[PDB]
Amino acid sequence: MAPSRANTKVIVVGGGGTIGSSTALHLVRSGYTPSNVTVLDAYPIPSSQSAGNDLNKIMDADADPAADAARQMWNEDELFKKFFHNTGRLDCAHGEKDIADLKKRYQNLVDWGLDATVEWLDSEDEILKRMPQLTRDQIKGWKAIFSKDGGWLAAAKAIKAIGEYLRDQGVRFGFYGAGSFKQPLLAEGVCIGVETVDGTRYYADKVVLAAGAWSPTLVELQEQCVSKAWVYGHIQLTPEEAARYKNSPVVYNGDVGFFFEPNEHGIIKVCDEFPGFTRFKMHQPFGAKAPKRISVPRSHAKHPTDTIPDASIVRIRRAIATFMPQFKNKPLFNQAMCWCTDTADGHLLICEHPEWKNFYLATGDSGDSFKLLPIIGKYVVELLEGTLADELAHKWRWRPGSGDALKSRREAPAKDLADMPGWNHD
Ligand SMILES: *Cc1cc2c(cc1C)nc1c(=O)[nH]c(=O)nc-1n2C[C@H](O)[C@H](O)[C@H](O)COP(=O)(O)OP(=O)(O)OC[C@H]1O[C@@H](n2cnc3c(N)ncnc32)[C@H](O)[C@@H]1O
Numbered sequence: 082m083a084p085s086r087a088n089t090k091v092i093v094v095g096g097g098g099t100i101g102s103s104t105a106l107h108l109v110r111s112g113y114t115p116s117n118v119t120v121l122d123a124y125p126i127p128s129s130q131s132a133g134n135d136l137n138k139i140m141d142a143d144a145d146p147a148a149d150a151a152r153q154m155w156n157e158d159e160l161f162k163k164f165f166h167n168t169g170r171l172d173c174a175h176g177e178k179d180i181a182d183l184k185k186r187y188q189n190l191v192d193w194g195l196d197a198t199v200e201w202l203d204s205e206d207e208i209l210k211r212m213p214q215l216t217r218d219q220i221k222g223w224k225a226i227f228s229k230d231g232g233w234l235a236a237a238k239a240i241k242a243i244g245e246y247l248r249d250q251g252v253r254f255g256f257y258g259a260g261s262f263k264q265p266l267l268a269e270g271v272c273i274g275v276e277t278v279d280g281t282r283y284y285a286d287k288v289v290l291a292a293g294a295w296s297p298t299l300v301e302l303q304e305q306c307v308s309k310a311w312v313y314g315h316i317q318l319t320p321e322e323a324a325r326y327k328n329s330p331v332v333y334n335g336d337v338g339f340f341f342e343p344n345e346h347g348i349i350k351v352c353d354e355f356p357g358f359t360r361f362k363m364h365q366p367f368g369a370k371a372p373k374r375i376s377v378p379r380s381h382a383k384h385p386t387d388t389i390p391d392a393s394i395v396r397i398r399r400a401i402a403t404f405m406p407q408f409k410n411k412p413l414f415n416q417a418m419c420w421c422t423d424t425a426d427g428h429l430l431i432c433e434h435p436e437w438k439n440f441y442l443a444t445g446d447s448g449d450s451f452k453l454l455p456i457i458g459k460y461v462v463e464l465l466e467g468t469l470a471d472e473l474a475h476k477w478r479w480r481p482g483s484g485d486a487l488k489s490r491r492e493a494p495a496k497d498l499a500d501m502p503g504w505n506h507d
Contacts, residue, residue: 086112087114088114089113089117090117090284090285090286090287091117091286091287091288091289091465092274092275092283092289093121093291094288095122095128095289095290095292095296096122096254097123097124097125097244098131098240098293099132099240099291099446099450100443100446100458101292102120102127102240102243102454103453103458103461104289104291104457104462105118106160106246107458107461107462108458109246109247111462115250115251116253119255119283119285120247120253121255121260121262121277122255123260123382124257126240126243126254127237128382130381131293132421132446133237134236135237135313135350135419136235137233137234137342137344137350138233138234138451139233139331139452140232141170141231142230143449143452147456147460148452148453150459151453151455151457154456155234155452155455158455161239164238165232165233165234166234166328167230168330169227169228169229169330170230170231170330170333171226171332171333172186172227172228172333173224173225174223174334175220175224175336179336183224183226184224187201199230201225201226202224204224205217208220208223208225211227212329212330214326214329214405215332219406223334232331233331234451234454236451239454240454255277258277258279258281261277262277262290262292263275263278263367264276265288265300265367265437270437271438271439272439273285273439274288275288287439288440288441289465290440290442293444294309294421295308296430296444297375298366298375298377298378299367300442302442303481303482304375304481304486305424305425306423306445307359307376307487308359308375308378308422308423309356309358309376309448310378310419310421311353311358311421312353312358312397312417313389313416313419314350314394314413314416314417315348315349315351315414315416316401316411317348317411318343318347318348318408318411319347322347326343327342329342334403335354336354337404338353338400338404340352340400340401340404340405351397351413352397356488356491356494356495357495358498359376359487359495360377360379361374361377361497362374362377364377376495379504380420381417381418386507387417387418387504387505387506388416388503390498390501390502390503391501391503392503393501393504394503418504421448422447423448424445424480424489425485425486426483426489427447427448427449427489429443429446429447430444430477430479430480431443431444431445431461431464432464441464441465442479443464445477
C-alpha cells in the first residue's frame with residue numbers, strides 16, 4: 082500500500098511562491114526525505130512573479146483558526162519571527178457612511194472578542210498624537226481605530242528564508258523551462274508526475290499545484306478562481322526623512338489607499354484600494370478542449386517594462402498627497418502589478434482534483450493569504466495524507482458553479498487591463 086513519509090515523492094508546482102514554499106517547508110518538517118521533494122517554479126525562489134515577492138504585506142487580527150495558527154508562528158517560529166514587524170495598524174475613515182462602518186467594526190471588538198489591543202480615535206488631534214507625521218489639513222473629519230496588534234511582514238525575505246532552509250536540506254529545484262509546468266502526466270486517471278515547457282518529465286507519488294494566479298491558466302478550473310491584479314509603487318526617503326517613520330504603523334483609509342513604514346533602504350510602498358484588474362485573453366489550460374477567454378496574469382517578471390494603469394497612478398498620487406503631502410514631488414518608481422486569484426466566496430481552493438488522482442490544488446488565495454505563509458503548508462500536507470479536518474476539507478472543496486468569482490466578495494466586478502491605459506510600454 083501507500084509509502085511512508087520518508088519514501089513519498091512529492092512535486093510542488095509553484096514552490097517558489099507563497100503556498101508552494103510553505104508546502105515544501107512542511108514536507109521537510111514532517112519527515113519527508115528532502116531529495117524526494119522537487120520544487121518547480123517558472124522563476125527561482127522567491128519567484129520574481131510571486132505575489133509574496135514584496136517588500137511588505139499587512140499582518141491584521143483575523144480571528145480565523147488558520148490565521149491564528151500563522152500568527153503564533155510569526156511570533157514564535159525562529160525561521161519567520163524576524164520578518165514580522167509589530168508596528169500595529171491605523172485604520173482611518175471619513176464621511177458619515179465610512180465612519181459609521183468603522184464605529185461598528187470597533188464596537189464588534191468591544192461587544193465580542195475583546196478590545197484590549199484597540200483604541201478609538203475620535204478626532205484629528207487624537208490621530209495626530211498617535212501619528213504626528215500626518216498633516217491636519219489632509220485628515221479633516223477623519224476618525225480611526227489604532228490596533229497595537231499586527232503590523233507588516235517582510236514578505237520576499239520570508240520566502241527567501243524558506244528557500245535557503247530548503248536548499249540547505251537538499252530539496253531538489255527546477256526553474257525556468259525546467260520548472261514551468263505544462264501538463265500533469267496521467268496514467269489511467271492517476272497523476273504520476275509533471276511535464277515542464279522544456280519537455281522535462283518528473284515522476285512522483287503526489288503533485289501539488291500551488292501556482293497562484295496562474296493556477297486557472299494551467300489546468301481547467303471552470304471559473305472557480307478568477308485572477309486579478311493589484312498595484313503599488315515606491316517613494317525614496319532620505320535617511321533623515323525615513324527616521325521619522327521608524328516603526329510607523331501601517332496607515333489605511335479605504336477611500337484612499339495605504340502605505341507602510343520605510344524599509345531599511347528608506348523606501349515607502351504605497352497602494353491603492355480597489356477591486357482588482359483582470360487581463361482576459363484566449364488561453365487553453367490542460368483539461369480544456371478548446372481555447373477559452375480567461376483572466377491570464379500579465380506578469381511583470383516576464384514584461385519588466387510594464388507599469389500600472391494611469392488610473393492607478395492618479396489614485397496612488399492622491400494617497401501620497403493625502404498621507405504624505407510633504408513628499409508629493411518624489412517620483413513613484415518600481416510601479417508593478419501583483420496577481421492573486423479569487424474564489425467566489427474568498428475561501429481557499431485546497432483539494433484533490435476530482436478526476437486526476439494524486440493531483441492536488443492549493444490555490445484560491447483570494448488576496449489575503451500571505452499572512453498564512455508559516456502555516457498553510459501544514460494543511461496541504463494534511464490534504465496529501467488524508468488527515469485534513471473535514472470542516473476545512475469542505476470549506477476548501479472543489480466547487481465550480483458556486484458563484485461569480487469576477488466579483489467574489491468584493492465591492493464590484495473587476496475591470497480589465499484592456500480598458501485601463503498606461504501600463505503597457507511594449
Ligand atoms: C498582489 C498583492 C497581494 C497581497 C497584498 C497586496 C498585493 C498588491 N496584500 C496582502 C496583505 O497585506 N496581506 C496578505 O496576507 N496578503 C496580501 N496579498 C495576498 C497574498 O500576496 C497572496 O494571497 C499570496 O501571496 C498568494 O500565494 P500563492 O502561493 O497562491 O501565489 P504566489 O505566491 O504568487 O505563488 C504562485 C507561484 O506559481 C508560480 N508559477 C506560475 N506559473 C507557473 C508554472 N507554469 N509552473 C510553475 N510555477 C508557476 C509563480 O512563479 C509563483 O512563484
